[model samples]
Structure formats: structure tokens, C-alpha cells
Target: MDYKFWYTQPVPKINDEFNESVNEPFISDNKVEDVRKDEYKLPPGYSWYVCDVKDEKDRSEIYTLLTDNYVEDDDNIFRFNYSAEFLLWALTSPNYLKTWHIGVKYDASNKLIGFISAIPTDICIHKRTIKMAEVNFLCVHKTLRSKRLAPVLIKEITRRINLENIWQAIYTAGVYLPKPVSDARYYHRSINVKKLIEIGFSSLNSRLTMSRAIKLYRVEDTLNIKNMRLMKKKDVEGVHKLLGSYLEQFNLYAVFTKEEIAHWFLPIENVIYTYVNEENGKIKDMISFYSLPSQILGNDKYSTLNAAYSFYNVTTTATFKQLMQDAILLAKRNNFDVFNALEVMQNKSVFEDLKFGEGDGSLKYYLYNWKCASFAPAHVGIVLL
Candidate 1:
């Protein structure tokens, strides 16, 4: 079935030609002044409010809303529980605008119920650099879903971004939309096999025994990469140059400045972890992952599953498999129950060697108000949280 709402948007059509030029906006008629000067109208009982994520009270409220109503697993067994600290780091990255952190509040009680956020970013698409918005954390109260509030939230955010003159955006979803620049499969590596099996997140494969499975997934407590150490502020320039050169091979990738590298790649306790493989005085390779725990509903034995999501990595000296093996070991040491990665960039080349299995879910990457040539998972280099 066609995505009815997406069909009317500026994204590429599902059946559009693959080689279409994406140098310009798909919808170029609207001007900033032409945009509605007033905020988009919401349902009668709700009003829009700009969220101040840096404030403790507002941060807690935003956290509560998402904790109670956010992305869940297919079986409804687990849901994303983004911590307040993580939200602060994510929403307040460099160049963030408080106005872009939109919230919908109930008029009577003045309670926050819905939200959408955008962060400024610059990306390189097929050798062309463009300023774009990374839109995410869109949510509405479960009761309000039937009211078709998602589209409104999206339009409101788009309008806000358009006013800033950034007409393009990048987002990811588990569900298929009008079109996707790329589709990537999910791969998972067990860090704590026993916990996963007990929670029914995974099961022993045919011809595999629990004891043997445990042995197979075991990783050493220490890292193997020579001179591998946590990333520091001084290493920003080295990482930026190394990562930029490595990412240029892909057709689509986020171009990070040194400042972005420091913000995103610097080790933030429990929120993100980054390491570099340094030889002498040069950073030869880099690897990073971030923590995102999920609430385990009705599991008496465990309430949360610590997951480490592969963030970004670039290699010039170590092989892809070697770099990821170290990543797995580091994640396991940090108590991550599982390590998840999307089959983008050169990840597919190492999944098998590093013991990662195909996950049931897939992520679709989309662009707003821009058309781009279709790409396979291998050609994709960008990974959105």
C-alpha cells in the first residue's frame, strides 16, 4: 500500500527514477516570508510551546512523556527509555536552537503531550555539500495518535526549519514511507548471552547449546587495538581529518567539523564512548558507540536492557573486522547487554566475522524537500540515532 500522506510530500516517489539529479530542492516555490507568520493551529485543547531542554523541570517533563510513549519493539516487549542526560546531550548538540525543540501542551493542565525536534547539520550528498536538519524524537501521547497529530507536528517542524533557510532534512524510520534514500538492515551481537536468552530477546540456534553459545560469545575484558585509548579534546583535529577523508568515498555522509567531532566523539560518561587507535602521534583509526537502554516490560528478572549502538567509526590502519571486534569487547566491558549496528557503510563486511546476526528490524533513511539517487546499504555512510 502507498503511504498516502508521504505521497504529497517533497521526498522522492517510490517509483521515481534512480539517477535523478538532487542538486536542488524538490519544492522551491515557498519563501520564508510566505510561511505562516503564526504558529500552526493545534487541536482545541492543546497549544504549542518551545521546549527548553537545558532546564531541569522541562527536561524531566520531556523525559517522562517519551518514557511513557515512544518507540517499542514488534512484540511490545521493550520500549526506548532515553535518559534525561542522553536527551540533554542529543537535543543540545552544537548549534542547537531551543526554538526547534517543539512541544505540544494540554491547555487545561499545561502538560506536555507531543514533541518533535531538529538539530542543525551539514551533509555531503554525492559530492555536494548542503545544510540540513536532523529531525528526530517525534512523539505524541498514545491517546492523541488517532487524531492524526504526527503530520501536523511534522509540518510545524518543517516550517520552522524552512524559516531558517534549511530546506532539507534527514530522518530514519522503521516503517516504510513515500521513499527512502537507503534502507539498511539491523545486525546485533550478543554481549550478555545469558541475560538475552532469559529475557527471550534471543534463543539458542539449531545445533547450539546454551553453554556453547555462552562460550562462543565471550569477549576478553581488555581491548586488543594497540595504543587504543579514549578520545580527547586534542584529538579532534586528527579525527576530523581522518574521518572526513574516509567518509568521502560514500555517496552520502555527514560532514563533521572539528567542533562537531569534539561534541559527538568525545567521551561523555554513560551517554557516548569513543576510542582511537593511535600509532605514534597520529590517529590511525577511530571507533565509537553510544548507550541507549530499553525498558523491559513485565520482565521480573530485568527491568532494563543496556544496549550499545554503533555510532561512527573510521579506519585506515586496522581492518573493519578488527576495529569492530575491539568495539564489541569495549561494549561488553561497559556492561552492554547487546551491540547493535545497521548494515551501512562497510559494516556488512564485518558482521559475520565479528559474530553479529541479522536482526528482524530494518531502518529506512529519508530526505525531506530533496531528491537523491537511490543507494544500497553499502553506499550509505550516515547513521542517525
Candidate 2:
């Protein structure tokens, strides 16, 4: 089924039904991840620059610079790009994917500096009533450190949020750097050591058992690289049903209608969703992503295409060991260093086999526009389900 891009509409404002956030102190017992500020002092002549990627004429140079220095590690995981097309999509797409950004530019001798961006999102988790923004891709060029470019970027983002009437914005970094208004405590869960070892895998780092887990799987011909094809309008109901059915065991599962899932999964253009299927083409698993060219500071000649985010990943079985392996191999083949999977449920064990890193923050789902929703701690691995 071919879905007309026209059928999708960009929201003028956040939906009212889900516009609330955690207000009544829904803080969980688990401690939040620590984010340490870079204390190194920046040498003079470095500064911060914030702008919409849409405003530049000669962005080819800066675009190459940023993508070259872009990090694919835990800290900078999205594999974002700085291309004119991406900027255009963020500015014009119905989805609130604003490519608002802040960067550091050097004088005279052309050098890279720090960078960050905050963009509004019409999140549907809370029913879309409350508007939310996220601060992403916070980075500093290796040469320019100890400078307060990150904080400056934060201030600029805050100003924009305030100007846009956004009620609140959320950011998570691997290291905890306390800011005046940000309330940083949060919770997360790790795999059961005994269970992981009981399976056919050994512990790589026993001391850091709570942080890392490794596993090996015997591959089968039944499962190979599934193509990411564009989803058709008629296929929406079937996709949603498959996803919901696979998740029926849990009485308190996350709720998303077919339309909602479509928005969340196929949120951008030129992107198709793919799945593992039986001989008759009955879908067994599904995931979608968009490819964009990234601009950092190094490796200017080669353009990196990224599989930005994963929305829903439902498999027929209890574990995702096989699927996880396939996804990473697919990502690597497509030249994607990282695949960003959203708010994973704390209960899931899929991340261990996949070797995914935890994000600095989470996509908090509050209950009321004025109050936070009560849920068990969410982790980076399974929150997107």
C-alpha cells in the first residue's frame, strides 16, 4: 500500500488531549545518570553560534565540518546531519522537527567549536496537549574545550523555548551537569546477571555487570536483511494489529492507535518501513527510519547517511536477540554508525544483545499537562515501544 505524503498533516499546535506533563512529583526511587561538565577552560578566540540550519547560503563548509567531527558514541547518538534538505524538512515538514541549532565557529583560521540544538515536538505520548522540546547533539570540538559553549547553547535554547511558549523542555546527557532549573533525578534498570550468563553468553566485564552484557546467536536463513519499504495507507490496520497483539501479554502496555503509530514510525519523508515476514509475507517484525546526510568537522568528502530513530519494534517471540543482530548489521551496511531507538521499557532485555549505549536523557511521559504520569522507571533500550 502506497501512502500519500499529502495525507499527513503538520500540526499547527500541540494536541490538547495529551498536553500534560508530570507536575505532582512523580520522581522514581532510582538515581539519575551523572553528567559532568567539562571543566577545562577554553582558550580565547572561541565563541558559540546558534541558528536555524535553514538560513545559510554557503553552509557547505560548516556542514562538512560538523558531520566530520560528529560522534557516534553514547553521548551523540542520533547520527544527525547538517544538510539543506534536512533543514528544509525541519522547517516545512508537518512534523515539528525544527533543526534549530547552536555551534562554535572560530575566527580567521577557520576552526570548529561547540554545538547544540533545541527543537519543538508535538509528542503524542501525553495525548498531545502539552508542547515539548528537546536539546540534542551537544558537542564540543576536541581542540576547543573548557569553554562554556554548552551552557551558552542551553541559555539560547531556553530563550527560544520561552519565546515559543513551550511549557517545558527536557534534556538527558550521560554525565550529570546540574543546572538551576533542571530537576535531574531519574531511574533505570539493568539485566539480571544470572539470566544473561545462563543463556549461551559469557560476561565480558563482571565488575560492570550492571552496565554491560554480551551474547552470541546462531543465525538462520529464515531471518536476513529485511527491506525498509514505504508503508501503504491500507496496511496501517494490519501493522498496528500485529504490534498490539505481540504486546498483549502486558495488561499495562503503552497505547497508540494505528494512526498514532504511523505518525511516530514514519514521521519523515523518503523513508520506508521494513519487517521480517513468513513465506506468505505475514509481518513478524517492523521498524522504520529516515536517512540524512550529516555535517560535522572531519572526513569532509564522504557523506554519512543516518537511520535517525526507531519508533515501534514488535517481534513474534519474547526476545529480540536475532532481530537485534540483524538490525545492527543492516545499520552498518547502510553506513549508519548508530541507530537511535527511543524510550525503551526498563523491563526489556533486548539492549544487552544489541550492544546499544544508554542515552543521556529520556522521553518523559507525564500524565497531565500540569502533572507527570506515574510509570515505572524507563530505560533507553525499550522505551520506544
Candidate 3:
């Protein structure tokens, strides 16, 4: 009830009645000239500027800022470490304007302290698509955040997006904002059981010994579908067409251009890994995962925990279970200690059979200016880094 900044935005209140059949923007008519030409000013020690992520100097500045201040577990055992390649792939979408990569620097020290980004995207809701900004990587200095400087960071990006004639935005967060269009839970399958248990990421049951626990999650070096291999550039068109049709079954999904398909799904070791099965030059099935390691806080042996997150999968020839099992095997070979999949987009079919442990929290999906009808976890078809 105390979301002061969200209340001023175009989003509907959580308790407000919404028609399930209706789907549209709350503030529809907006023009470039109508928006504020100047940016929201910062405090005396801080000033606003755009970080050119393509530039190595700018990338490292923002990367260091985020790695030090990004999301962390409540127990303070783990912190997300999004690599520079992942950030580059996420922020530098096709036709993205440089100004949307907003950042705030301490004018006195010339330190990059705060940042946010808005990449051009098209969101499909109930079969109708709209051009909107895909906003992510909003970070600010922890001290300034206690003073509520985050609201300024949010409004500053909003103004920049508005100046570019984009009104709506899609962003996901662990914290509850004004309202969420949908929600999803996280699930994980253990790979390096002993390591996880030692690090307190997993537990050793009273009845089962350490050896039994390790043997339980073990899998032989194998591939469920022998034909499935690393996705190649030649397979982009086939996978793109298949993925587009598959995502249409969901209530909320994103539309990507062919160029985007190449960028997001094409294999990049230590970043994104995609596997596909092609028969006689036609793509029949595909599965993929992305690498997002976590820094282990206070750990004596390990400094970072390698994690593989399930990205997108389309299976027509093989069973979902086999496909996911194959993904785990693939992840195990790559040194990923654990593999995580959300309960969305046909992902629940293999959770129980694959021995996945449900994570503690739920991820909420929020739309900035659009009030979409509420949906279940299964109907969500998008994933944010």
C-alpha cells in the first residue's frame, strides 16, 4: 500500500478491478514532443549520462558496479555475477538507442554509481503485439537507495524512453511492485551434490548418507537424443520459426526478429548454449541453457558457483522428460553445479520426475503501462536476465 512511486505511474493498483477480456495500455496516446525534453536532475554529487556498453571501458565500469551491488540471497551466501558477455547480449539488442542505457556518475569522484537500461522490444499479449521497451539492469548505490534515490533512477529512464516515443515497458523483479501480471516459481536440479551440501545450498538428509545423496543425483555421460548437438548459425531460421509458433500458445510472450534469434539462441560457450535436433535439414526439436554463476560469500574452497539456467526449449520428437534430462547431462559436462528451471512455459512436466527442488521464492512479472489480465505460471513465455 506504500508504493509511492508506482502509484504515480500508469499502472493499476493491486486491488483495482480489471476486466479479463480487455487488454490495452492505461495511457495510450503519447508523442515525443509531449514528453519532457530535459532529464530528471540528480543531486549535487551525482549527474546523469549514458554508458556505451559496446565500449570496453564503459562496459567494465557498469559491470563492476552491478557485480558489487546486484541481487544477493537473504542469507548472504550467494550473489549473482552476470558476466560482461551476458550483459552485452542482453543490452545491445537490434536498433537499441544509446540514451536508453542510463547511468549516474558521482561528479566529485567520477565514479559510476547508478544505472538502468531500456532496449527496444515487441511484446505480444493475447495475439496483439506492441512496440515497447524491455527494461532491465536497474541498479543504484545501496546507500542512495535507502534515501529513495531509486525512484529518480526509474523516472529518469522513463523520460528517456518517452522521448524516444516508447510508452510501455516490461520488467520483472523479486520485489512486489504495484501489481504483477503473472508469477512463477523457481526449481533446481542438483549436479554437484557434495559441493552444494558443503556450501549450504543443499542439505544432506538424516537417513541418506553423503555417498547415497551423491549417487542419487548422478547420471552417466549420455545424450537422450543422439542427433541433438550444439545449435549452429545455419539452424537459426529453423529454430526461430519453431520457437515463434511454440510461444504463441502462451498468454504473454515476446516477438523477436531473426537478428535477435541469432543473438539470443546461437551458442556461446560460458554464456549461452543451445542444442538442436535436425532431420534431413528440418529442425525438429531444441533445448538450451545460459550460464549465470554466483559468487560464494565466505566460502573457503570455492569462490564462484557455476549455474546453468534453462532458457528455451521446443520438443516435438522427444519427451519433455528426456529433453530436460539431456539438458542436465549437458550442464553436468559443462561443470555447472546446478541447473534451474522456472515453472513456466511447459516447464512443470518434468520437475517431479527429474528430482528438482522447489526454490524458496517466486518471481513476479510486471508491466509498466499495460494492464494485462492476470495469468498463471504456465502461461508466462518470457524470461529476463
Candidate 4:
């Protein structure tokens, strides 16, 4: 696991002891003048390009690049199929910059083969708010893997961001990078146990019949909250206060403005669903999950598996278990085949009771050009899409 390239980057050495006490940027005092002035050189056949997510033609090319080559199951049976609407929502955050959204295209055919993106946001780490770029979709086409393009693409993104005067960034990957500040695993609660079994995602134990497995994984058929309603533009401030205060207890979490809250937490059909629980005109709790289906390969019966990811939740009066159970039922109502969640932010407490089976997939959370105390998944409150 030697990282010759990463050694030159600003990250902790793999052998270094984790005893650092302060939460600060690795290159804290850099100015725009110190950044590289030109784009990092790419292969002669390819060039750096900006992605206009608002254009359908551009998004279709991105969709093809990712659908055929993004992260897949270890068994190679499923690959992520991020919807077009989802790309618009995730990339178009408040005051999203154009240069931060970038990709690489082959000059001969003009094929979009590589992609990466970063969004502007602030994270409150150890009571200090630091502006950082949340980088995601850092992917390269499988055919181009031998080109050693990942390293250059990352260096290019860093250069572009530094040009903007943003000195810090963060990203995540299922395959562990040089190192990770926190680690978490996937926990899935079966919404359609029969379908999950038929699709070879979950195995039926030899001791139990198919019907028995279905009965065991069944969720509630009705609503879980008495005063629950789909989140609206009007509930932005309330939910911002409710969720932000809950996140303050964690060691690392995102800071959101009320405007950002409306852009993020408000429900959008087939994209995001957030519900607020209120009584006597006072919002108390909230739950949200986003839709991210996977392309099921080599299957004649099904082509896609609808998966709901647990995004964010705030619990004031309801128990974590109860709130999560309601979330599962809500996903079931929405026709999701499985409910996926990471083992972060007080989520494990609801696993056993809700029949969420632990998956083999483990996600590593990384902070670029930043070093601080390594913490457990419980202290990680931010979720990267």
C-alpha cells in the first residue's frame, strides 16, 4: 500500500501516530499568489473541460461515463446509476462555482472519460468554521485506468480550487485512499425482501423459507408520526435550527444557512424526500433520505435496483429507533427496494431492531490538506452525496 504520489501531497504519513491535538488546515496560510498559475498538463489526447450541469447534452455524457465505470459492488453485479435530476440538485448548491465542476474529454472523439466536482460549504470542526470544498464523483473511466489519470485529475482540481483561494477540501471513497480520518460501513434494511432475494443481493438462509424471510423483513404499513408533513419552503428556518443544533454535538459537521437549508432539505419528487414531525405548531423532529438506484447487471428480470440512502435526521422527542423505523416505512411507501444507510451519526442504534443487515461495503471519509484527531464514525455528522 505504498503511496508514492500521495507522499508529495499534504496528508498525514501512514506510519505517523495519531496524536495531533489541534484542528487546523495543513497549508493554512497560503494565498492565491502561491497557487499554480496554469492547468496541470494532461495526456496530449485529452484536455481539461468545464461541465455545465444545466445542459442535458453535457449531463448525458457524464451519465454515460459514470454509469459504465463508477464504483460497483465487489461482486461486479451492480453499479451506481445517479439520475440526471440528482446531478442537478447535488452540484447546484448555493452559489456553486462553474470552474469547480470539471471533467476531461478525449480530443479525437470528444468523449467525456473522467469527471470530478467540488461545492463550496463550511464545516464547523472543533467550534471553528472553516470554508472547504466538498469533492465528489471523482471517477475515471475503466478503459483509461492505465493512463494514471486519477492523480493528474486530482492535482488539477486542487490547482483550480487553490486558484479560487480555497485551501482545503474533503472527499470519500469505498476503496481506502492514502488514509482516512473516519471509517463507516453500509447498513441496508430490505424494503422488498423477496425482490432483494430474487436479485441475489441477499441470501435466504437454509433454515428459513422464502416467505419466512419476507415476513421477517416486513416493515410497518402505516405512518409513524401523528403530525408529520413533507418539508416545505416555509419549514427551512425551523429545520435549520433543529438539525444544526443536533449536529453541534459532533466533532465534525457541516454548517448551513437557512437559504442553504431550503436548497438541501426541501423535498423534490424522485430526488430527495424530507419530512418534519411537528405538534402544536412546533417542529420537533425531521428525517430525510435520497434516491440513488443501482444498475443490476446480467439480470433478465430486473435492470435497476431502487436504493434509498439515509441522508440526515434530527430527533428531538422521538427515539432514534422510532424515527428510523418511520424512515424505512416511508421508503417502502415510495417503492424503494432497499434502504441504505452509513454507520454514522447515531444510526447503528436503529440497525438491529429494524432488521438492517450489515453490508460488506465500507466507506472511507478523507480530508484533503487537513490533519486533526482521528475519530470514530459516531463523530462524523456530514454526508457526501
Better of 1 and 2 by TM-score: 1
Off by over 4 Å in 2: 1-62, 68-99, 107-112, 124-129, 178-218, 224-285, 289-311, 315-343, 351-385
Rate residue 60 of model 2 by lDDT.
45
Candidate 4 clash pair list: none
Q: TM-scores across all candidates?
A: 0.97, 0.50, 0.98, 0.98
RMSD of each: 1.4, 13.2, 1.1, 1.2
lDDT of 3 at 160: 84
Q: How large an RMSD does model 3 have?
A: 1.1
Please write out the lDDT profile of model 2 over residues 1-385, one tens digit for every residue.
1212211212111322222353322222212232222322334765545445555642444455556555543434234454555444433333343435556667655555566666554333333233556555566665555555555565555555545555454444444222211122222212223332332112355555433342222223343435433455555666777866754443123444675555544434434344433324555565544454333324334334344444456556434566655554544444453455544432235565555556455444322113333334342222321
User: By TM-score, how accurate is candidate 1?
Assistant: 0.97
Looking at model 1, residue 199 earns an lDDT score of: 91
After TM-score superposition, what is the CA distance of residue 143 in candidate 4 from its true location, in Å?
A: 0.9
Candidate 3 global CA lDDT score: 0.89
Higher-scoring candidate on TM-score, 2 or 3: 3
lDDT against the true structure, per candidate, is 0.88, 0.44, 0.89, 0.87
Determine which window of 10 residues in candidate 4 has minimal summed lDDT.
15-24
- Backbone atom clashes (below 3 Å) for every candidate: 0, 48, 0, 0
**Candidate 3, 1-385: lDDT as tens digits:** 6888889899989796577778989988888887888778778888997799999989999889888888887778998999998888888878888888988999988999999998988899877798888888889877666776788989988998888788889999888888989889999999999999989899986788999999999897989899889999999999988898899998888998899899889988899999999998988899899999999988998889999999998898889899899999999989999999999998988999999999988889988888768889899998877
TM-score of 2: 0.50
